[PDB]
C-alpha cells in the first residue's frame with residue numbers, strides 16, 4: 001500500500017500495550033515503512049489460504065481481542081529485524097532488506113507457527129495447549145531465523161542438518177528474547193504454551209532432558225518421526241550452545257562460559273560462512289571452532305570453551 005507512515009497503539013496477546021508502525025491510506029494498515037522494504041501483517045481469517053488480506057483498521061487502535069495476534073506478529077517481527085541489523089549487520093533475512101510478511105489467524109485452533117519458504121504463518125492455538133503463537137517473542141524470532149538459514153547455509157530439513165536448523169532457530173530466538181529483555185530465559189515458547197500450567201515450556205536449552213530430549217549424542221534419536229527428530233535432536237546442540245554461553249559441568253566435562261554476545265557472534269559466523277545444506281553435527285563443531293578461531297585466535301579461551309562444550313555433549 002502507498003500512504004503516510006504513522007504510529008498506532010495496540011494490546012498484544014499477553015495484554016501488554018505497545019506502539020506499532022502503520023500506514024495510512026483511507027484505512028490504517030499494518031505496514032511498517034521504517035524497516036527495509038517493510039513489515040506487512042495479514043489476516044488469514046481462519047482459513048489456510050495465504051497470505052490473506054493486508055491488515056486494515058479504521059482508527060489506528062488495535063485493542064480488540066481479534067487484533068492481539070496481529071499486533072504481536074507485527075511488533076516482534078520489527079524487533080527481530082532490529083536485532084539482526086544492529087547486532088550482526090544483516091538487513092532483513094536475505095541481507096538485502098526483503099519485505100517481511102506474516103499471516104495471523106491461520107486455520108481453526110492451529111497449534112503451531114511456521115516459515116513456509118516465503119512468509120511466516122501463525123495459528124491461534126486451541127486455547128489450551130497454546131494461545132496465539134505470535135505472543136512469544138522467541139517463537140517469532142525462531143521462525144524468522146528459518147528465513148535467515150534458508151538464505152545462508154540452507155540446511156536441509158531432515159536428520160542431523162535439520163536438527164542443526166532447528167537449534168540455530170532456538171539459539172537465535174533466545175538471543176532475540178534477551179536482546180529485547182522480555183523476561184529472558186533459556187526456554188522455548190514458555191509465554192504461549194499451556195496457559196493453564198505454570199513454569200513449563202515446549203523445550204529447554206539449559207536442560208533438554210526435562211521434556212525428554214537428548215542432552216548427549218549417545219542419546220540421539222535414530223528413527224523416522226519428526227523428519228528424523230529435527231525437533232528432538234536439536235536438544236544436543238541447544239545444550240552445547242547453553243554451555244558455551246553460561247558454563248557448567250555436564251557429564252563430568254567442565255565448560256567455562258564465554259557469554260551470550262560471543263555465542264551469537266560465533267554461531268552467526270558459522271551459519272553464514274561455514275555451514276552447508278548437508279552439514280552434520282561434527283561439521284558444526286568444526287565450523288564453530290573455526291569461527292571462534294577467526295574471531296578470537298586459536299589459543300583463545302573462546303576456542304577452548306567451544307571444544308569443551310561439544311565434548312560435553314559427545315559431538316566428536
Ligand SMILES: *CC(=O)N(O)[C@H](CC(C)C)C(=O)OC
Nearest residue numbers: 112113114115139142143189
Ligand atoms: C514454528 C517452527 O518452525 N517450528 O518448528 C515450531 C517452533 C515453535 C512454535 C516454537 C515447532 O517447534 O513445531 C513443533
Ligand SMILES: [Ca+2]
Nearest residue numbers: 057059061062
Ligand atoms: Ca481499531
Ligand SMILES: [Ca+2]
Nearest residue numbers: 182183184185
Ligand atoms: Ca521468557
Ligand SMILES: [Ca+2]
Nearest residue numbers: 138185187188
Ligand atoms: Ca524463552
Ligand SMILES: [Ca+2]
Nearest residue numbers: 193194195197
Ligand atoms: Ca505453560
Ligand SMILES: [Zn+2]
Nearest residue numbers: 142146166169
Ligand atoms: Zn523451527
